[PDB]
Design a binder for this molecule. Structure first.
Ligand SMILES: *[C@@H]1O[C@H](CO[C@H]2O[C@@H](C)[C@@H](O)[C@@H](O)[C@@H]2O)[C@@H](O)[C@H](O[C@@H]2O[C@H](CO)[C@@H](O)[C@H](O)[C@H]2NC(C)=O)[C@H]1NC(C)=O
Ligand SMILES: *[C@@H]1O[C@H](CO)[C@@H](O[C@@H]2O[C@H](CO)[C@@H](O)[C@H](O)[C@H]2NC(C)=O)[C@H](O)[C@H]1NC(C)=O
Ligand SMILES: *[C@@H]1O[C@H](CO)[C@@H](O[C@@H]2O[C@H](CO)[C@@H](O)[C@H](O)[C@H]2NC(C)=O)[C@H](O)[C@H]1NC(C)=O
Lengths: 213, 194, 218
């Protein structure tokens, strides 16, 4: 096959920044390169064909350049909604090799999480398992430390986190941490606490509840 | 071996259905002396009688039941469940008492794809009505006449999954089954083997 | 106006087979070229093959030749991807896409939403759904969607009438080998007594929908 090698692998840029993504073909493709934008959980969307031609309805901040082996996609002024993975494609002939993608994430000002805690439901408890959920809502940057304390004892090996993809409007993230205990373990302790450390917090924030109260 | 009262008798007097509060009383029962009713009210719960909704997992309590002397009425079932899993060990329905004085087995408006009554060898008296189970196949494969103990017992299988649709989707007896039919698609569901 | 919709994704045991469908609307498959492209979770795009429904000409990636094949029913305006002898590594979102006629090249101008095929020696399992009760200005509430397999589930609130402030988290595989996620929403605290909140969970791999009303705990 023809190889299509994209660089950089990822980038973090601010709103209004110029962004340049590169794609190198292993042989001469003339101008037979297309570019796509893929948002998470969505199908790729066609941006550019024949290396430099803007597909109908695509914003003019997107442009493409190059011929032969070296091709570039430029976003003249990055917008928050431009968070995506961008792909080049060898568009002629088969097998139409796609590049490995470049992930573009948005850099913005610090924003503190709003923190919430949720006890297990009585419905789940009758089933023999307790899930305790901590929510960190709408924060930046992504990096956060979230720790579970049960009657002041730090928990390890019994929680998992999930983080949303960057919001296309304000570039923030949200995060869930879920602590899993047996009903028996859950019922032998009183205080359930989620402690959050983050750049936007002057000191860590704790949300907690007392079982049964 | 343990005999327990059915719905309407003893601990189950004035109960409409097996339900969250009464289902514990069937623990370890091998024979129901009376009838079993499983109704939508069981799963919805009932404010008037202070009955919480039945956790469908509690139905597993019934797996020890081998005999019902009266009738079995099932008009609600976890939509999640493809067969009558809790009754996989039921061997005999006697129909000494019958629903409306007529029916010993009534399986009505469920989401099941097969009956799964793999241990059932006899329905001594009463009619069988299998009605309105839109996903249900396999029921017409059973030789009901052979399960029956009283001349003139009837089986009516109405408004379940169309015969053509069961054939088109492959929901017919496994190749390993004899002509006696089956309770579902698996070799364990065959009434008898080839 | 042009739309493509893939269906047929779900759990397949290793060694098993599956046929995916791609329903076109707004244009006829006959007269155009359609491509199948897949994407393993967190990975890049891989072209699989193409078909001209008119004439029935097909071409395939070397990686799947002999195992995957493409067909089309012009009366149904639907294309198909037949996949034999599936392996764990074939786990991916499968897309169909129309080849554009803006130019000579195979720029792909319309894509379906994709359908997720999971190849695993595991069992299909529908989700348990538990409320994340509010009030513990703004109230947060949600649903915990736990212990399902395979992916994916979708979640809406009040049948899609509530979208503002909703976060449905990426599923995470638990140590049990079953997925779990939460969907949360923030709403005015003052609305808790006057607005019903229901999460609608769809687990297409097990053909299961679940609705859960989430209310303040008493
Ligand atoms: C049927 O679904 C339930 C869960 O579905 C429910 O979630 C509840 C919490 C409520 O919100 C309901 O309204 C909602 O529909 C599953 O729990 C059940 O699966 C069983 O779960 C048991 C505990 O996880 C487990 O012990 C069983 O093994 C499991 N059943 C099996 C054999 O898979 C579903 N029942 C099925 C699939 O038969
Ligand atoms: C569910 O079963 C319970 C029994 O566990 C029923 O409760 C009985 O109800 C009758 C009629 O109201 C009373 O005579 C009994 O005193 C009740 N017994 C107990 C222990 O509570 C209940 O009625 C059933 N509910 C439904 C709808 O079937
Ligand atoms: C009601 O029963 C139907 C029939 O079994 C269920 O739909 C099936 O779900 C399985 C996955 O477990 C699919 O593989 C089948 O293709 C489905 N059947 C068809 C052809 O529709 C349905 O899930 C049940 N309802 C609930 C709420 O569980």
């Amino acid at each position: 096959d023809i190889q299509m090698t994209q660089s950089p692998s990822s980038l973090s840029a601010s709103v209004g920044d110029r962004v340049t993504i590169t794609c190198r073909a292993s042989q001469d493709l003339a101008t037979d390169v297309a570019w796509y934008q893929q948002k998470p959980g969505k199908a790729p969307k066609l941006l550019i064909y024949s290396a430099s031609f803007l597909y109908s309805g695509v914003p003019s901040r997107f442009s493409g350049s190059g011929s032969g082996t070296d091709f570039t996609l430029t976003i003249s002024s990055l917008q928050p909604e431009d968070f995506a993975t961008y792909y080049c494609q060898q568009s002629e002939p088969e097998p139409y090799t796609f590049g490995q993608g470049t992930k573009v994430e948005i850099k913005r000002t610090v924003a503190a999480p709003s923190v919430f805690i949720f006890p297990p439901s009585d419905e789940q408890l009758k089933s023999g398992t307790a899930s305790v959920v901590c929510l960190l809502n709408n924060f930046y940057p992504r990096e956060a430390k979230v720790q579970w304390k049960v009657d002041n004892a730090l928990q390890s090996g019994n929680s998992q986190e999930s983080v949303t993809e960057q919001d296309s409007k304000d570039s923030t993230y949200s995060l869930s941490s879920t602590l899993t205990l047996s009903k028996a373990d859950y019922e032998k302790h009183k205080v359930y606490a989620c402690e959050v450390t983050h750049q936007g917090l002057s000191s860590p924030v704790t949300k907690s509840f007392n079982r049964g109260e | 071996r343990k005999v327990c009262n059915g719905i309407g008798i003893g601990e189950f007097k004035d109960s409409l259905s097996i339900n969250a509060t009464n289902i514990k009383h069937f623990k370890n029962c091998t024979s129901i002396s009376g009838d079993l009713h499983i109704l939508p009210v069981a799963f919805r719960g009932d404010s008037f009688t202070h009955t919480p909704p039945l956790d469908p997992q509690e139905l597993d309590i019934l797996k020890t039941v081998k005999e019902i002397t009266g009738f079995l009425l099932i008009q609600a079932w976890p939509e999640n469940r493809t067969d009558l899993h809790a009754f996989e060990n039921l061997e005999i329905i006697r129909g000494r008492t019958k629903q409306h004085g007529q029916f010993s087995l009534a399986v009505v408006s469920l989401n099941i794809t097969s009956l799964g009554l793999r241990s059932l060898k006899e329905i001594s008296d009463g009619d069988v009505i299998i009605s309105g189970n839109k996903n249900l196949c396999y029921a017409n494969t059973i030789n009901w006449k052979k399960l029956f103990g009283t001349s003139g017992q009837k089986t009516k299988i109405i408004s379940n999954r169309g015969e053509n649709s069961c054939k088109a989707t492959g929901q017919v007896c496994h190749a390993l089954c004899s002509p006696e039919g089956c309770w579902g698609p698996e070799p364990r569901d065959c009434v008898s083997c080839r | 106006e042009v739309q493509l919709v893939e269906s047929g994704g779900g759990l397949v045991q290793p060694g098993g087979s599956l046929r995916l469908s791609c329903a076109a609307s707004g244009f006829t498959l006959s007269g155009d070229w359609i491509h199948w492209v897949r994407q393993a979770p967190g990975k890049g795009l891989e072209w699989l093959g193409e078909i001209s429904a008119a004439g029935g000409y097909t071409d395939y990636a070397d990686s799947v030749k002999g195992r995957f094949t493409i067909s089309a029913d012009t009366s149904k305006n639907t294309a198909y991807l037949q996949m034999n002898s599936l392996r764990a590594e074939d786990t991916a979102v499968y897309y169909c896409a129309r080849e554009s006629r803006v130019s000579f090249e195979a720029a792909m101008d319309y894509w379906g939403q994709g359908t997720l095929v999971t190849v695993s020696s595991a069992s299909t399992k529908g989700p348990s759904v538990f409320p994340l009760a509010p009030s513990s200005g703004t109230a947060a509430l949600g649903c915990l969607v736990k212990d399902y397999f395979p992916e994916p589930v979708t979640v809406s609130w009040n049948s899609g009438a509530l979208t503002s402030g909703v976060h449905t988290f990426p599923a995470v595989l638990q140590s049990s080998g079953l997925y779990s996620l939460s969907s949360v929403v923030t709403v005015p605290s003052s609305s808790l007594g006057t607005q019903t909140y229901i999460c609608n969970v769809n687990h297409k791999p097990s053909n299961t929908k679940v609705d859960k009303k989430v209310e303040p705990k008493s």
